[PDB]
Write a protein that binds this DNA or RNA. Structure first.
Ligand SMILES: [Zn+2]
Ligand SMILES: [Zn+2]
Lengths: 778, 65, 69, 274, 192, 98, 57, 100
RNA sequence: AAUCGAGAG
DNA sequence: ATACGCCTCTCTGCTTATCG
DNA sequence: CGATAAGCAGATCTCTCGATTGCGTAT
């Protein structure tokens, strides 16, 4: 047997004739699967696509003319269907355009964006529909809206791209750009937080809190913060238009669903009636509300107060009743991951969050670390593209209403039923949504009325520079903590935590300023780009023994709280919850039960002494980080996430599997490293800073960018003339097809102190070898 | 109804008013518009104890280990 | 890209042996060491030059700006 | 240590030194047991460091509190802290209840937006605002229960968080600007005694245990206050030098002396900044 | 870089003595009776209290670090230079470590005998909220390898968990050097 | 108001009580027509679950519901039936390999 | 640089006659000082030279 | 052993709140569509109640009397209703549609 | 000229 | 096609206030 | 007058590259 093979004949045959079915390197495509899948999820998939859901939740914005209790004629402009075309050209009958032409022309590779407006009048009296082109929207290569989507390597070569061209990037002004993946708080999970900044937020502020980052079905997010004041009252927080507002928690608790106060007492305090801490804090809260707001005795009155309080900041229409605008803000701010028609579930989740806040302030649960990988997810970049597009079409829909308002206030008459008037106004506004998206790609700046729940503004897209193929493939696996942490002094954010085992590469990190903040995924790490079928999971859970969350009336860490994506499914004892988690894992790994997708991340937190807040947490959404691992019972592949991993024992190799201690084992230890960190020979014999230096330096080598260089017009390109394959190489050198892109040369190296001209770090090159073309490049 | 220092109506489940906070012999439910008497609510007692993480000291460390 | 004319270290002409190496690998069922020895490459400096050549010229040649594709 | 210390010394000249310290030489005729006794006598003890638990029994039968303060056993705290039943009872009678009532009345203001025992209880009631009972275990030093009656307009208070805050912030026996006095292992022969604070005049009295002529401190501003410019210059040199001693970096004393004489050129502690 | 057969024998014999050092350190920090089993409920409870409480965790880390450093010192003294097949002045690694041309006895020791305990700031490796220091190790494991004590050397290579801990320490060093060079210069500017 | 499709049951059935009141909860895979027992060759875990579950029993009218009081009338014991599975003990002689 | 973070600038193009030569007759095309290793501790480069020689043979 | 199991609606269980007591003058009226609605009233109260649609399709509840001497245990079926009790004087209070 | 991004010691 | 005005996570030291 | 609780200010090596830089409007 031979440990490795050069595969010379196979490689040369494949060079001669590119495959006509599929590329021979499947792993080289799963590397860019996050970016491609994120851009794909906004046009295809269930529910019509992310852009369609985004327009649906943008809804209608109305205005009144004022012409003669009767506010005038109502105009409600909106969009209900958005489509992107694969890029065409008129050079009549159009012809397909491929990115080679965009590269050669030094221009962008963009497809036309079409929105069909709804010019509704008088709530359905008559509707004027007209599709409007809104500029050429840039699209990423190898996506379902790109013309290379299904081509074989043979067809890719015929269309001048590459033998194994990968997408995941855009082309703007003849320059390739990539939306970096950012790592943000885990969605739809309330995590206890201790922050001295919360105390700084004013006076009577503790440092405790409960922060949940709810995500809408169209992948937009809303952060709700549940502060605790030292007196005893709990404060709700949210941000709407780059400003921040505060609300008593009891206001929202009563506004959500028609409920009593004994129900709030039972929801926050379960069977723990004898718990003086909880009872006294809750009495303080209830009496503080009944003192401050004695004229809000029912849900309708509370909603009307909220509506009166929120008029000019929410751009509520003159027709909107106070009750309905209060319902609008309640459905548009509070726990948006449950969406509308989920007031009861939002009520349960707020009660759970309040009890968790009281546990955090009583020191019965430890604070959840927000910078630990256990409590994080990835913002894919295609999702950010969809969110920015939704914000831009919202701005457009508001700008056309601004135009008609300016017409109204300039003294000109109108007719909302007139297609001529609709045409006249639609040509006085800005419809280069595509040009604004191109601006975002070409600068990185995020021009926004809402910060999209994100912290930074600039620094969102980097050029996918192609010095070298390691550099190029590294662009598509780098994840950033955010530019806020770039200028800081808390070194603890850069620490290599054990919570990233198998998700973040321990080695691949740039040295210097971006050390610790710029990370790379382990090469077998996968970021999900779709929601797993979870409709049947609550049904299976009730059969397993989960008592339903509607008629059980339990609360506290004394019981396990079963949740699914932030929705309290039911309550169960801790032992039975452990059994439920084990049985769910078994049924999920064995592919018999149709209601348990293998991507399901059953993150179970056992009871402990002042540890993390317990309960059984189930996740199946987008943006999760998942890695394969061998489930030991029935010996099949399993999928785990960072949240689930910090509690499960996973033997690194099968030799040290212990009795009744391990339920998992890695497929191989080498799948906790990046591609670059796997390509280092005998990495486990060097000092780790030298492995980090190698990851940094292998992206800077004058290797081979690609083979279609006669069809590119890049600003600067470095090409090694004659590369060679390594004699000593990892088994994954072939799996990613790195032989297609040679990076160096096998050299005869004498470790000798002979010359005198190489002492500190210099090295000597043979003159004759140099004259024979050793290490030549252009 | 009565839980420590808290009393809830048995009809609408609304928190009442504390007895010694309003006009005499009549504590009124703000939802049910019912009338409750100051009787049978003799002592709303709550017994609390300190956190046991509240007083870090040299002697407290020696208490356990 | 294309086979080097000479070995880098010693200078032995190894540019006329790449096609023969492929022939001996394909037609004959020879392992790489046997094929390199039968080509006359004894020093490992000369053996590496052929054993590790990639031959990217073939992949470069598929992008021909002078013939219709 | 290190560069933060250099910032404190030469960059900031902070009179508010982060860790003030005094090195107290001991006379050669003072044994280790007396050294520890002096350390515990000097070191401060807060009320929180002697209390095991506190029980607050609110009753609405007008609203009253029964605050019971459970102490560590006498054979424990009178040994570890040099604190007696009498000293504890005096502290609770004088400072604790006054601070507690001050906190309570401030809280309400924010909300509006054996005949010896009998006579002691009567005196405590008369002097204090709204206390109605008081009994201290004068035979075991084990507990202290005192009632506290508020009005009927008063809203509910936790009465445990304020009690904890008062119990922490109330001292028992503290010398100003001094927290702890630890007796480390003697090094290079001489036996030292380092406190976690600077109060030169407090140990000026303790001629018996402390060689006052050799009390060398860490805070440059304090020694400038009490001893003068030149002692400040000496301690500047010493503090700017012993930072380099742990890092084993040899810097000549001419540089440090020139920097010290530039920093004390006006007779004060001038920093190197604007 | 190699040792003798007798040198390797001494190295492995002294390293076998490092099996119970972590368990003894835990039993003595937790004040439990020595020779108590590693799966004792009281030991696990006290280790959990120590995990929650930062100062107690630091005490445990420092005590166990001292014990494993003693084991490392024993290994190095027993195996260098008396356990090395090629000896000074022929042994060039040892030669230039002794001579001051480059390197030190610590580097030679890590290449030939033992990398030893990996120290993060001034403590052992970070622990999760479940008491696990890595997915492989069971919660509250009183094993020196679990705490970052790597018995491997750069000649025979280090295991995956040891590789992970060593990467932690190396990243910490690379961060600390940047912080230090950033902070050095303002002092000199203001003084000058 | 009455939501569409809802039709009020008018004639109810008797309840022979003057005996212990029990509550038992079954899953959706248990045929109710027919502490770890076997039902239809299946494995079911059974355990037990300031009250909220009141008892509504028809009065002597067979047309409405009332709250018994012999202050509600609470069930003497609440049971639960749970679906389970057998977790296979790992055979170490295979996976444990040098 | 090697694949072990052993970066260094080329200090001279040493003529081949002045290069050291082996009993086999070959003259190395790269010379790296032995002092780059004791502090960097890149034993992977040593074992890679070993394995590369064995593989090319 | 199990002798008779009832399917026709006989009894039901509700979740009003902790320690709920109701006067003897009040009654309840059921509705079946399986989704259920319950309704009751008195002078200043309303016993409205619905059920969780997503849960009733999975969990089923059984009631029954037991015989200490015999074996013919009794069995029954009873759905669960999650009820929200409402007042009457605090139901229909509103304000202006928009405050100027 | 700024701003952003990538680097080197 | 085009020419005027519009677009959220550190630190010491100086200085004023303000209330019994 | 004065002693904090509070508010406000100005700080926190050298070198090489590339890419973009502003939108609405009234006539
Ligand atoms: Zn009532
Ligand atoms: Zn040769």
């Amino acid at each position: 047997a031979r440990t490795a093979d050069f595969r010379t004949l196979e490689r040369e045959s494949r060079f001669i004739n590119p495959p006509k079915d599929k590329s021979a390197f499947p792993l080289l495509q799963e590397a860019v699967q996050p970016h491609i899948g994120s851009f794909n999820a906004l046009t295809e998939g269930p529910d019509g696509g992310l852009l369609n859901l985004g327009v649906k939740d943008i809804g209608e914005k109305v205005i009144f003319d004022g012409k003669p209790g009767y506010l005038g004629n109502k105009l409600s402009v909106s969009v209900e269907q958005v489509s992107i075309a694969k890029p065409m050209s008129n050079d009549a009958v159009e012809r397909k355009v491929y990115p080679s032409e965009s590269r050669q022309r030094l221009t962008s590779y963009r497809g036309k964006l079409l929105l069909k407006l709804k010019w509704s009048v008088n709530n359905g009296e008559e509707n004027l529909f007209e599709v409007r082109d809104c500029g050429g929207l840039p699209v990423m290569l190898q996506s379902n809206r790109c013309h290379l989507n299904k081509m074989s390597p043979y067809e890719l070569v015929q269309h001048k791209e590459e033998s194994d061209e990968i997408g995941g990037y855009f082309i703007v002004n003849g320059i390739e750009k990539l939306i970096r993946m950012l790592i943000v708080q885990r969605r739809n999970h309330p995590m206890a937080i201790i922050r001295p900044s919360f105390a700084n937020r004013g006076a009577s502020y503790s440092h405790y809190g409960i922060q949940i980052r709810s995500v809408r079905p169209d992948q937009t997010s809303q952060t709700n913060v549940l502060h605790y004041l030292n007196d005893g009252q709990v404060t709700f927080r949210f941000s709407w238009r780059k400003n921040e507002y505060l609300v008593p928690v009891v206001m929202i608790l009563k506004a959500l669903c028609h409920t009593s106060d004994r129900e709030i007492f039972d929801g926050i305090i379960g069977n723990d009636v004898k718990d003086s801490f909880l009872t006294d804090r809750l009495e303080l809260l209830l009496r503080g509300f009944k003192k401050r707001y004695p004229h809000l005795q029912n849900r309708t009155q509370v909603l009307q107060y909220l509506g009166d309080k929120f008029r000019v900041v929410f751009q509520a229409s003159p027709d909107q009743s106070d009750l309905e605008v209060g319902q609008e803000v309640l459905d548009r701010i509070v726990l948006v991951h449950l969406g509308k028609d989920g007031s009861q579930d939002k009520f349960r989740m707020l009660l759970f969050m309040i009890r968790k806040l009281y546990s955090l302030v009583a020191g019965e649960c430890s604070p959840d670390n927000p910078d630990a990988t256990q409590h994080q997810e990835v913002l894919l970049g295609g999702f950010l593209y969809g969110m920015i597009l939704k914000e831009k079409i919202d701005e457009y829909l508001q700008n056309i209403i601004a135009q008609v308002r300016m017409d109204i206030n300039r003294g000109m008459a109108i007719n909302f039923k007139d297609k001529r008037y609709m045409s006249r106004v639609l040509m006085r506004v800005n419809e280069n949504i595509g040009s604004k998206m191109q601006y975002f790609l070409s600068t990185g700046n995020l021009v926004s009325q809402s910060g999209l729940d994100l912290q930074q503004v600039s620094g969102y897209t980097v050029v996918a520079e192609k010095i070298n193929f390691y550099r190029f493939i590294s662009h598509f696996r780098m994840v950033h903590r955010g530019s806020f942490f770039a200028q800081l002094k808390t070194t603890t954010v850069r620490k290599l935590l054990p919570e990233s085992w198998g998700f973040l590469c321990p080695v691949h990190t740039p040295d210097g300023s971006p050390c610790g903040l710029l990370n790379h995924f382990a090469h077998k790490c996968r970021i999900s780009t779709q929601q797993s079928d979870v409709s049947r999971i609550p049904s299976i859970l009730y059969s397993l023994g989960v008592a339903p969350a509607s008629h059980t009336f339990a609360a506290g860490p004394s019981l396990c709280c079963v949740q699914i994506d932030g929705k309290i499914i039911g309550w169960v004892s801790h032992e039975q919850g452990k059994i439920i988690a084990d049985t769910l894992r078994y049924w999920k790994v064995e592919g018999k039960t149709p209601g348990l997708p293998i991507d399901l991340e059953i993150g179970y937190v056992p009871p402990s002494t002042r540890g993390q807040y317990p309960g059984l947490y189930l996740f199946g959404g987008h943006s999760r980080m998942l890695r394969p691992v061998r489930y030991l019972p029935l010996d099949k592949e399993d999928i785990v996430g960072p949240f689930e991993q910090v509690y499960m024992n996973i033997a690194v190799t099968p030799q040290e599997i212990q009795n009744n201690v391990h339920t998992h084992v890695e497929f191989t230890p080498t799948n906790i490293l990046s591609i670059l960190a796997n390509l280092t020979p005998f990495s486990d014999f060097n000092q780790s800073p030298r492995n980090m230096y190698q990851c940094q330096m292998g992206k800077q080598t004058m290797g081979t960018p690609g083979v279609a260089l006669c069809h590119r017009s890049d600003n600067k390109l470095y090409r090694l003339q004659t590369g060679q394959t390594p004699i000593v190489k990892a088994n994954l050198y072939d799996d990613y097809g790195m032989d297609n892109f040679p990076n160096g040369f096998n050299a005869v190296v004498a470790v000798i102190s002979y010359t005198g001209y190489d002492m500190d770090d210099a090295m000597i090159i043979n003159k004759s070898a140099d004259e024979r073309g050793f290490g030549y490049g252009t | 109804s009565v839980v420590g220092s808290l009393i809830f109506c048995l009809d609408c489940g609304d928190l009442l008013e504390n007895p010694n906070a309003v006009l005499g012999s009549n504590v009124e439910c703000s939802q049910c518009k019912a009338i409750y008497p100051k009787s049978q609510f003799s002592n709303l007692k709550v017994v609390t104890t300190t956190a046991d993480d509240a007083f870090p000291s040299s002697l407290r460390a020696k208490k356990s280990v | 890209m294309i086979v080097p004319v000479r070995c880098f270290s010693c200078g032995k002409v190894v540019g006329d042996k790449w096609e023969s190496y492929l022939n001996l690998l394909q037609e004959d069922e020879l392992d790489e060491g046997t094929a390199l020895s039968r080509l006359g490459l004894k020093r490992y400096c000369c053996r590496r030059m052929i054993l590790t050549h990639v031959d990217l010229i073939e992949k470069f040649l598929r992008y021909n700006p002078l013939e219709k594709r | 240590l290190g560069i933060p210390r250099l910032r404190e010394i030469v960059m900031t000249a902070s009179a508010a030194i982060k860790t003030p310290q005094m090195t107290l030489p001991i006379w050669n005729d003072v044994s280790d047991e007396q050294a520890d006794t002096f350390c515990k006598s000097i070191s401060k003890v807060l009320l929180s460091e002697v209390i095991d638990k506190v029980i607050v029994t609110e009753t609405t039968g007008a609203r009253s509190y029964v605050i019971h303060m459970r102490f560590f056993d006498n054979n424990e705290y009178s040994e570890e802290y040099d604190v007696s039943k009498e000293e504890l009872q005096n502290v609770i009678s004088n400072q604790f209840i006054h601070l507690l009532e001050a906190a309570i009345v401030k809280e309400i203001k924010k909300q509006k937006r054996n005949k010896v025992q009998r006579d002691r209880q009567s005196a405590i009631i008369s002097h204090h605002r709204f206390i109605t009972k008081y009994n201290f275990d004068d035979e075991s030093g084990k507990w202290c229960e005192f009632k506290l009656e508020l009005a009927a307009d008063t809203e509910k208070l936790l009465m445990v968080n304020i009690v904890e805050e008062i119990c922490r912030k109330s001292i028992i026996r503290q010398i100003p600007h001094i927290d702890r006095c630890v007796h480390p292992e003697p090094e290079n022969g001489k036996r030292v005694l380092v406190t976690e604070g600077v109060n030169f005049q407090a140990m000026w009295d303790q001629e018996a245990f402390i060689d006052v002529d050799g009390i060398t401190s860490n805070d440059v501003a304090a020694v400038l206050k009490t001893y003068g410019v030149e002692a400040a210059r000496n301690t500047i040199v010493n503090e700017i030098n012993n930072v380099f001693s742990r890092y084993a970096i040899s810097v000549s004393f001419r540089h440090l002396d020139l920097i010290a004489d530039m920093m004390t050129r006006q007779g004060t502690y001038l920093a190197f900044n604007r | 870089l190699r040792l003798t057969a007798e040198g390797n024998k001494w190295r492995t014999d002294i390293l076998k003595t490092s099996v119970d050092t972590g368990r003894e350190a835990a039993a003595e920090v937790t004040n439990l009776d020595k020779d108590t089993p590693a799966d004792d409920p009281e030991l696990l409870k006290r280790l959990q209290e120590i995990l929650r409480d930062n100062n107690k965790s630091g005490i445990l880390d420092a005590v166990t670090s001292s014990k494993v450093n003693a084991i490392t010192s024993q290994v190095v003294s027993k195996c260098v230079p008396d356990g090395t097949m090629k000896k000074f002045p022929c042994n060039s690694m040892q030669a230039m470590a002794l001579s001051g041309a480059k390197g030190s006895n610590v580097n030679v020791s890590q290449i030939m005998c033992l990398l030893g305990q990996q120290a993060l700031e001034g403590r052992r490796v970070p622990v999760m909220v479940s008491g696990k220091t890595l997915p492989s190790f069971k919660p509250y494991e009183t094993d020196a390898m679990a705490g970052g004590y790597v018995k491997g050397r750069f000649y025979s290579g280090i295991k995956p968990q040891e590789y992970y801990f060593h990467c932690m320490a190396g990243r910490e060093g690379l961060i600390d050097t940047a912080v230090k060079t950033s902070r050095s210069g303002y002092l000199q500017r203001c003084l000058t | 108001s009455i939501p569409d499709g809802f039709k009020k049951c008018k004639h109810l059935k008797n309840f022979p009580l003057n005996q212990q009141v029990w509550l038992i909860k079954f899953p959706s895979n248990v045929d109710i027509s027919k502490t770890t027992m076997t039902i239809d060759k299946h494995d079911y875990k059974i355990m037990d679950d300031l009250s909220n579950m009141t008892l509504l029993v028809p009065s002597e009218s067979k047309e409405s519901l009332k709250i018994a009081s012999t202050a509600p009338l609470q069930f003497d014991k609440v049971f639960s039936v749970s679906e389970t599975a057998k977790i296979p003990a790992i055979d170490y002689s295979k996976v444990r390999v040098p | 640089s090697s694949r072990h973070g052993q970066k260094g600038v080329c200090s001279r193009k040493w003529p081949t006659i002045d290069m050291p030569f082996s009993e086999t007759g070959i003259q190395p095309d790269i010379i790296i000082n032995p002092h780059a290793f004791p502090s960097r501790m890149t034993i992977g480069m040593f074992v890679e030279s070993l394995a590369g020689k064995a593989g090319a043979l | 052993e199990i002798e008779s199991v009832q399917d026709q609606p006989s009894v039901a269980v509700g979740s009003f709140f902790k320690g709920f007591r109701a006067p003897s003058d009040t009654t309840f009226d059921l509705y079946k569509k399986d989704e259920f609605v319950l309704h009751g009233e008195n002078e200043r109260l309303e016993y409205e109640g619905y059920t969780d649609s997503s849960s009733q399709a999975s969990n089923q509840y059984v009631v029954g009397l037991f015989n200490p001497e015999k074996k013919s245990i009794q069995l029954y079926k009873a759905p669960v209703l999650v009820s929200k009790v409402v007042s009457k004087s605090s139901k229909n209070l509103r304000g202006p549609k928009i405050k100027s």
